[PDB]
Amino acid sequence: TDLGLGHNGVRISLNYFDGLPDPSLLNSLYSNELKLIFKSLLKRDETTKEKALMDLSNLISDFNQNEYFFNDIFLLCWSQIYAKLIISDYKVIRLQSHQITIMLVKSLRKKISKFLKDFIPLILLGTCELDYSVSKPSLNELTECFNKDPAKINALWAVFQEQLLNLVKEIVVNENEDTISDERYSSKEESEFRYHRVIASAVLLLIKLFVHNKDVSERNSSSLKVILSDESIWKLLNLKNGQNTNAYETVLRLIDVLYTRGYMPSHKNIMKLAVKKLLKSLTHITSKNILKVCPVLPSILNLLATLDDYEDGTIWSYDKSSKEKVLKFLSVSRTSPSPGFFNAVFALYSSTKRHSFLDYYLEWLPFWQKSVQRLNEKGFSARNSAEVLNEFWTNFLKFAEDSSEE
Ligand SMILES: [K+]
């Protein structure tokens, strides 16, 4: 039978309706004290649940006295609920759950070896949470767990490659908003937010997987394909009035890593899927939300410049009206500039001129002209006006040296 994320005979999953501890298994736990704890963890009341974890976290602190409590039965059961606690909408629950597991790995080093394939992927997923207040404490705990040995952590991304990729597949492909959140106790909005947060983590975890591994594309190609072919990751490229741009930026990073590692030239279909969704995205950037999108504008421009290098700007052909789409994006983006912005524009210019994407005098020059005009009116009110202005003139002066050629 398919055990999902499990490797010790029981099913581990992120959804709410399977992968739960067997009542007869729970009743085999060493102590009645553990049974009450697990009984409260399986309840919804956040208060009693938060208290259950606290009790559990303390039992593990005084591990020497309660070593027999944390036997194979305990680990089996825990491995199943842990996967569910780390998607709790209360970060308190998520923090403690990650802490407990990391503690067990430390207090049980060689006696927990069977379960590393079931714990390490979820531990690392915790370190990949966009919320720094969750990911950083998890990383400090994990780091300490291996005595601050850097190579000992880097080894994890290699050793547990397959399981990590399986966890991503689980999140992106096998699960969705409605299986991750129970509609009985969650509104559509909370479910959207819950999935958003989890899949965002999975993208960052996927990024780190590419960074730490050169031969990631070769070993698990088939699985990488079903992950990157799904519509779930690329859905994070949708701006929303309530959401911030952290997930958006994460996807931009993914596209960048996939291209630099040469995965994109090897999979033209995933290329066209990412570029198309990225171009659709630009059209949703308007004056209404420009202040919100402001901090990613340089990243967008920098990404488009990198992708333009691919076979003399072939990506633009994936949509005949892309030249027009870039035009409306540049015209809007210059109404909310920031450090790095004009640097990235020049990057875009420098690359795209190699096939004369946009007219030098009719489209490029008016852009630079209207930019400085706004800068002079707004500034020098706030920062980083000074930096931004200097950056503009530096890039514009380089742009201006090609005027002779036309
Ligand atoms: K999905």
Q: How far is CA 55 from CA 3, 41, 49, 131, 145, in A?
A: 29, 11, 10, 25, 21
CA of 224 to the centre of ligand 1 (A): 15
Q: In this structure, what DSSP letter does residue 233 have?
A: S
Contacts 24+ apart (CB under 8 A), 153-160: 154/212, 156/120, 156/124, 157/124, 157/208, 157/209, 157/211, 157/212, 157/213, 158/212, 158/213, 159/120, 160/116, 160/117, 160/120, 160/121, 160/124
Decide: helix, strand or coil at residue 4: strand
Please report, in angstroms and rounded to a whole number, the separation of the first and last CA atoms in the chain: 69
Alpha-carbon span 88 to 284, nearest angstrom: 31
**Alpha carbons 257 and 304: distance in angstroms, whole number:** 13
Cβ count near 71 (within 10 Å): 14
Q: How far is the CA of 99 from the centre of ligand 1 (A)?
A: 28
Question: How many Å lie between the centroid of ligand 1 and the Cα of residue 386?
Answer: 45
175 is written with which tokens?
């699960």
In single-letter form, the type of residue at position 4 comes to: G
SS3 183: coil
Phi/psi region, residue 312 (left: phi>0; alpha: psi -120 to 50; beta: rest), is left
Which 8-state DSSP code applies to residue 12?
B
Distance in Å, CA 354 to ligand 1 centroid: 39
Tokens standing for 207?
């990024």
Beta bridge partners of 4: 12
Q: What is the DSSP letter of 22?
A: P
Q: CA 336 to CA 371: how far, in whole Å?
A: 9
Q: Give the DSSP letter string of 238-292.
A: ---SSS-SHHHHHHHHHHHHHHHTT-TTT-HHHHHHHHHHHHHHHTT--TTTHHH
* Dihedral pair phi/psi, residue 4, rounded to 5°: 65, -110
**Residue holding tokens 């291209």?**
259
What spacing in Å lies between the alpha carbon of 235 and ligand 1's midpoint?
Answer: 10
Question: 298 CA distance to ligand 1 centroid (A)?
Answer: 29
Residue 12, beta-bridge partner list: 4
Output the CA 202–ligand 1 centroid distance in Å. Answer: 11
Distance in angstroms (rounded) separating the CA atoms of residues 99 and 78:
13
Supply φ then ψ for residue 263, to 5 degrees.
Answer: -80, -35
Experiment used for this model: X-ray
Judged by DSSP in three states, 398 sits in: helix
Reading the block at residue 173, the tokens are 């492909």
What contacts 204, CB < 8 A, 6 or more positions away? 128, 130, 250, 253
3-class secondary-structure state, position 162: helix
CA of 203 to the centre of ligand 1 (A): 12
Q: Report the alpha-carbon distance of residue 203 to residue 247 in Å, rounded.
A: 9
Cβ–Cβ under 8 Å, residues 342 and 391: yes
Resolution in A: 2.5
SS3 sequence of 303-369: HHHHHHCCCCCCHHHHCCCHHHHHHHHHHHHCCCCCCCHHHHHHHHHHHHHHHCCCCHHHHHHHHHH
Distance 344 CA to ligand 1 centre (A): 33
CA of 232 to the centre of ligand 1 (A): 5
Identify whether 384 is preceded by a cis peptide bond (ω within 30 of 0): yes
Q: Please list, residue by residue across 122-141, b when 16 or more beta carbons sit within 10 angstroms of its beta carbon and e when fewer do.
A: bbbbbbbbbeeebbebbbeb
Residue pair 340/361 in contact (Cβ under 8 Å)? The answer is no
* Rg, C-alpha atoms of the chain: 25
> For residue 193, is the peptide bond before it cis, meaning its omega torsion is within 30 degrees of 0?
no
